Amino acid sequence: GLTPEQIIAVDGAHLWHPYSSIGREAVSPVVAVAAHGAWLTLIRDGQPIEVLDAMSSWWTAIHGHGHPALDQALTTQLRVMNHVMFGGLTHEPAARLAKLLVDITPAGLDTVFFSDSGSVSVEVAAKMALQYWRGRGLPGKRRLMTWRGGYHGDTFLAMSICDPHGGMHSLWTDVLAAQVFAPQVPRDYDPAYSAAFEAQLAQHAGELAAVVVEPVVQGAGGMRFHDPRYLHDLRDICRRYEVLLIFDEIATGFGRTGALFAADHAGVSPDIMCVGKALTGGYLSLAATLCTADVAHTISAGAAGALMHGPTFMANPLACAVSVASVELLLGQDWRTRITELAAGLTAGLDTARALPAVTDVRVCGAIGVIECDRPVDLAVATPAALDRGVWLRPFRNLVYAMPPYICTPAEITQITSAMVEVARLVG
Amino acid sequence: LTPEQIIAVDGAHLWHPYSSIGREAVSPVVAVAAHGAWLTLIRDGQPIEVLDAMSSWWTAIHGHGHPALDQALTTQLRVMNHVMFGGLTHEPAARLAKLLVDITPAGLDTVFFSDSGSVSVEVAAKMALQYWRGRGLPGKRRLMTWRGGYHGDTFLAMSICDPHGGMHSLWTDVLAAQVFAPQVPRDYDPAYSAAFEAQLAQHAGELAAVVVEPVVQGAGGMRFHDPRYLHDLRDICRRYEVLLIFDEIATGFGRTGALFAADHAGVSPDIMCVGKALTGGYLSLAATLCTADVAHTISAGAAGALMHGPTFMANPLACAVSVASVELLLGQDWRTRITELAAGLTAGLDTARALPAVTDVRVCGAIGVIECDRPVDLAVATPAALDRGVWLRPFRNLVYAMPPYICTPAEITQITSAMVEVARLVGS
């Protein structure tokens, strides 16, 4: 065991944090000692304090932390079978979860490949698309196309379809696969944008295995929203030019944008889909890649005859079991009303930020609320300001944003938005 | 779901490792429980207990449902399932990082947690590339390895897989082009090391790192090599200013008879990956360690940080069970336990040497291998071993086992007996 002071000492000497340095961080991490419901217990000045997890621990904790149904599902599985290899064996948690995912995802996604993180699920999606065209005798179809502003993970293939600025591709000159980038997709629908996207794809169609995009909401690359009609156009362009369509719903899945999956806003189905994050209710890392029967059969009939991927902990019973419970818990309530109330609460609470000096935009989409500023937000000013108000916020670039747990009460949303508005006040 | 229902869902909707959809010659066997060294499988509608001779692909070193690991998981679950690692730290991450820095080869001072072995290999490569960019030498961006290796299934990891006999051979047209030395021999031969140095010498200005599995090459062929080669690699790498990366994802935590396989040569790499047995086989987790010099050179570079950070980085639940699994290993006389397992494998596999289809029998720690003269047919091997009460998973021409450390001498003899009978049938 360790005290918080001992934890800080070990951490500063031995632990890498995300996108961080060793030994030169301007803000040292805060010790978290517990998490229950929508609240984290953090150590501030040696005092344990409770604060709202306004980020849902990066979109994951949709039912909040320590939800009794999900705790119970994990403990139930632990007593029967922690894990077995998925090579030559199958089990009830994988079957139950696969059945659920094929039933609730956009129509036609009939097969499920489990992996251990979002970035791996993106690599599997890419491997499916490339092997598909190898199965059709067209191995020149091996590049990916996307639009700017995206984020798809940070393994090296996922990096290649990241936004070049968000992903700091200037640091990776001559390392990354060179993919095709269309301009940033706009918020409001403009058919000229889609016509330009189609003309650019048409030029590269013989080189392209797939278009890969985040539907409706671009998360880690800038918390930007776009009209769902653009996804309708992508589905059409890809159909006509014989390029696969991949939707990365790792951040948008499981109700977060006001539909079960963001693709449902446009009423279209991709050929391949990635899910993760909220899949397990935020308990454990699990991800999945789904594809159509056509994709699966074309891969399986090719000369390779097999999708050559298979992580050690593929379809981990513990992770699948808690995911089954998390999914069933979402589907067994009126989640659509819940998200509508959350969006209304975010809109009401963030409205006064629209008039602030340094605010360039305020936008809400489902249980997502964003304040865009005209300058970078200083973490050394924002974090104490948010903590003083009992809220854990993690701004980045010029954005103050939240994706609260679905179980947040109106008062908790008021508390979250009040902290967001104050952070934006202190920016200007 | 009943076992028949699971089989139906699985055939319709589940991808398995390295497999097709609809064209697998052997349907998977339903697993319904796991306890200690035993799996409960459904065969012809009836449950049978069989030994997990593969440790669920090297992970279940303490067996399944060990009370100390079950309890560590439920204890952490009652406190905090998960919190984001951005701006926060926690006791499971600090406890695990402190343990790992203390037990790994000297000089490995910092720890980056990720969710899978393949990701940890990508993190290792990113560390090596950002290191040389931090030294103003971005041309040092290629990797060198020896043939027969395997390092995971993501696209960078695939680039250092064996390019001919390796499972990723058909992708070489789209992978990064790395430098490959010939297969390292079993016995020590100074001419091999001289040739390795001569080949590295002409690429040194473009090489970021040498990446190898130390002592045992696993998924690429269960080949063992003399630890003195690792001494030579460390010397070559230091003299030519190339970083040395050891992938101990399969070899770590006592499996080869030393705590880490690098310990057989007394060698410290600059970067090291661990995984699999890290969590006792409960949950997916991996780690990448590097020296202070590597961490500080990355942190002082123009990037100012290591540009990686997955959603579930440093998951409290996975870290907590890993802490317990590592402490359980260190709190017993693991070295004597592994020596006894190795002696049991050696004694029980000896009769396989006389079988007509067997070309080699070799043991290293708790690893036992029968190498046959033809590929082993799973349709024969799987029921033959199940008939003998053992779950075995041959691959290529190999019948092999990596049993849980808790196996009794009688259980090891039951495992080796089933392996001998599989080998006997291979030549029938």
UniProtKB/Swiss-Prot annotation, chain B:
Entry similarity comment: Belongs to the class-III pyridoxal-phosphate-dependent aminotransferase family. BioA subfamily.
Pfam families: Aminotran_3
Domain of life: Bacteria
Subcellular location: Cytoplasm
Residue sites binding pyridoxal 5'-phosphate per the record: G117, S118, D247, P310, T311
Pathway: Cofactor biosynthesis; biotin biosynthesis; 7,8-diaminononanoate from 8-amino-7-oxononanoate (SAM route): step 1/1
Protein name (database record): Adenosylmethionine-8-amino-7-oxononanoate aminotransferase
Cofactor: pyridoxal 5'-phosphate
Gene3D superfamilies: Aspartate Aminotransferase, domain 1, Type I PLP-dependent aspartate aminotransferase-like (Major domain)
Subunit architecture: Homodimer.
Positions bearing the site annotation: Participates in the substrate recognition with KAPA and in a stacking interaction with the adenine ring of SAM: Y18
Signal peptide: none
Modified residues (N6-(pyridoxal phosphate)lysine): K276
